[PDB]
Symmetry: none
Subunit: 75 residues, 3 copies
Amino acid sequence: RSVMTEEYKVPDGMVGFIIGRGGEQISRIQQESGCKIQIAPDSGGLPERSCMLTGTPESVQSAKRLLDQIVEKGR
Amino acid sequence: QRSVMTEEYKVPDGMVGFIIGRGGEQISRIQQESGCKIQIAPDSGGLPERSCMLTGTPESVQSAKRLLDQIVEKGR
Amino acid sequence: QQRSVMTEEYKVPDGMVGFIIGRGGEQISRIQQESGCKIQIAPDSGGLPERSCMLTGTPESVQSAKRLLDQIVEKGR
């Protein structure tokens, strides 16, 4: 139940959508999950972009589900 | 020159939004690719160009200019 | 050491995080600029001795960042 940090991956082509205009989408996901979500700035041509998630295990799992939900809306 | 340096640079005012990209994802990426910090002023005050401050080694600063040009050359 | 930018997990001592970041974030801003590496630090270690970081850059930049971070840690408090 202590806070922990996990690596996670999102599609490079969805990063802009995940963050959203004015960062409003990533602010929503962090609030809804109780997780800090930090996204790397560059994939260097690879298909995924690394993220660091920090929260309780329950919050981290929630953040993964919410990120997946955004990706599943596509572009 | 080897050391990091800072200079002024200009981009078209009408390209600023495109350069930054949704969620700032494009400007974050081109800074990482070039090694150059790219700070863009918030307002042109009616002028056609927007001022930017570029900080990096000369090689990084040149790279950033090339990447910015390539974005501008895609237009809208 | 391939050419492309890559992302690595890395760790710094929890008790050094403030010193690494520096007053007004000036130190971490500078070492990122010097190394060419984005250095993202998690906000909380949850009682563990190390704090997770994500380093993004070319292999050469990532190694430079590790050296600069080690140099700061080796100055201690």
